[PDB]
């Protein structure tokens, strides 16, 4: 199913010109229809003959669908804040034997990498040099991500599930923050 | 006013970097990208993109890391180009704000 | 050495990197070759120079174009001249930009 970021991840009114602010992402129609709370919230907040801008389309109070980027012409673009503080406990969650694919990066923001084994995504893991409590870890994980992306080695990803990013759109896999990347073969203590 | 346009299915062909003429506080890492499937008549075959870099704090930008990896691996991506223009080889070069490696037909039509 | 030349960019197309020079606390230098002949000598430094901040983004590309003999063009700033190379018939000047060459795009 399509993962829908919660209600609290939306700014009041996005920037004009079509460029959403830094650390924010454009909203597609699938995510907008994903949660009815967002539907009613934008139903009552915005009044008058107002049309906004979406990546996969627009919003009115019916919803239209268009080409990617076509509706960015109009000023007001919804921007979901990418980061949400879940409040989940600080633990280690490991997912093993996956490989990098489908990288995401933005302006003054984080670097993302979908991890996939056997054809399907497992966990979306990302690092942010600027924002986040793990900011001291990008200057250490960028090298590992580059190596395991150029060589495409089966690698295990250890994430901490405090923060929840939403940089990818229509992303079935959940996006989290990554702490330890390990090049390992099955049956090892350093795994 | 250039509204941000979503460019789909480019491959970064050339990587070129320069000093920024505005301030001594920013690098200009840029490139030339080419769409696949379109004719060479349109400027869609040599579309130039630029992005700055903070030279006060040492290290590498995550977006620069992506540009290196993708350009080496010659892989498709989707950019959000606009609305700032920077000089490059005497011609305008738009600034990209975020770049997403494509998954399939649905992601990058 | 500050030559006093009026701080203009210089375009050197279709060159490849050879003959890296470096010292302990000083700048690194590279000769650039086209069709077997030397064209320009460009150097970068993280310790002294107008473009001292330039050095990390420069070394990120110089290493690549030295490992891979890719098509490269050099933008040189001629304010500062260097004499590191012994008996250098080619002029050695400061390095301000490295641009990978795409003949298909015909930019370089």
């Amino acid at each position, epitope marked *: 199913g399509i993962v829908i970021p919660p209600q609290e991840q939306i700014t009041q009114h996005g920037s004009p010109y079509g460029r959403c602010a*830094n650390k924010t992402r454009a909203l597609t129609v699938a995510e907008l229809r994903g949660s009815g709370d967002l539907q009613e919230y934008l139903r009552h907040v915005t009044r008058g003959w107002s049309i906004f801008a979406l990546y996969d389309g627009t919003y009115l109070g019916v919803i239209k669908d268009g080409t990617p980027g076509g509706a960015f012409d109009l000023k007001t673009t919804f921007c979901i804040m990418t980061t949400r503080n879940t409040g989940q406990p600080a633990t280690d969650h490991y997912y093993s034997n996956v490989t990098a694919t489908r990288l995401l990066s933005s302006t003054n923001s984080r670097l993302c990498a979908v991890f996939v084994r056997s054809g399907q995504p497992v966990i979306g893991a990302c690092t942010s040099p600027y924002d986040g409590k793990y900011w001291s870890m990008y200057s250490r994980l960028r090298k590992m991500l580059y190596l395991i992306y150029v060589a495409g080695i089966s690698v295990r990803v250890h994430v901490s599930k405090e923060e929840q990013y939403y940089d990818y759109e229509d992303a079935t896999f959940e996006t989290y923050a990554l702490t330890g990347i390990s090049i390992c073969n099955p049956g090892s203590s350093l795994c | 006013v250039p509204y941000v346009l979503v460019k789909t299915n480019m491959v970064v062909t050339s990587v070129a970097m320069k000093p920024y003429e*505005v*301030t001594p506080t920013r690098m200009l890492v840029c490139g030339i990208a080419a769409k696949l499937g379109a004719a060479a008549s349109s400027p869609d075959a040599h579309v130039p993109f630029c992005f*700055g870099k903070d030279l006060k704090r040492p290290g590498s930008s995550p977006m620069e890391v992506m540009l290196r990896a993708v350009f080496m691996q010659q892989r498709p991506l989707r950019m959000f180009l606009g609305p700032k223009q920077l000089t490059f080889e005497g011609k305008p070069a738009l600034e990209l704000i975020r770049m997403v490696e494509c998954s399939g037909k649905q992601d990058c039509p | 050495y500050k030559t006093g030349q009026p*701080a203009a960019d210089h375009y050197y197309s279709k060159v490849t990197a050879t003959r890296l020079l470096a010292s302990t606390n000083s700048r690194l230098c590279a000769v650039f070759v086209r069709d077997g002949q030397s064209v320009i000598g460009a150097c970068a430094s993280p310790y002294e120079g107008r473009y001292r901040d330039m050095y990390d983004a420069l070394r990120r590309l110089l290493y690549m174009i030295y490992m891979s003999g890719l098509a490269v063009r050099v933008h040189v700033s001629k304010e500062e001249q260097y004499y590191d190379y012994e008996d250098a018939t080619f002029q050695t000047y400061a390095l301000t930009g490295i641009s990978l060459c795409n003949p298909a795009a015909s930019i370089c």
Partner: antibody
Amino acid sequence: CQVLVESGGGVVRPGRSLRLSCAASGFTFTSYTMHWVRQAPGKGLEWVAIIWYDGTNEDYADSVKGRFTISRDNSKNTLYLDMNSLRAEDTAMYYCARDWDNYGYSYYFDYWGQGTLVTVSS
Amino acid sequence: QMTQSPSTLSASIGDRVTITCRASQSIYSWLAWYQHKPGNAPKLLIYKASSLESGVPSRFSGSGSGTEFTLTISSLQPDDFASYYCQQYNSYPWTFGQGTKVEI
């Protein structure tokens, strides 16, 4: 056109907090880096505070570190400078300045404000 | 430090005026020349030591010979009566000038 109105200046005893507000109209308030600069009576202008177009980096001059906190807000199109532990030196005419290069990181300013007086004395 | 000269000067309507600003270390072409109306908001006049902002009369000109910079007003309409500041944007801190007054 671009405008920049200042507000919130007055006599403040040493060791008290104050808020200087900047309002702008006709353009996005903080799609541009915005700086705070003051002039002492009969002296040279100096630079104090910087704000990016999102709030990522906020550096301060060596004389306002640890006693000045800078702030932005795009909902109300407001720039805020908060003074705490005001000293006798900062008896100055303060105002804010928008950068011209757009989208961050220029240290030359295009549109400034009419200026507001903030005086520190017994 | 980044110091102007002269401190004050006078010139009638239709004359030319020259102001020099010097620095302890080289600033290359990272100069901004500002006009300071006493009792108003400064408006930018010269950028990059040579260029001109939009909407500015062309009489202003700048020369950027390295350490020593010059700003010349070719013809002085009464509007040019203000202070003038030289500013670097190369290295910390972003020092401004001390001002130079223009009157009759």
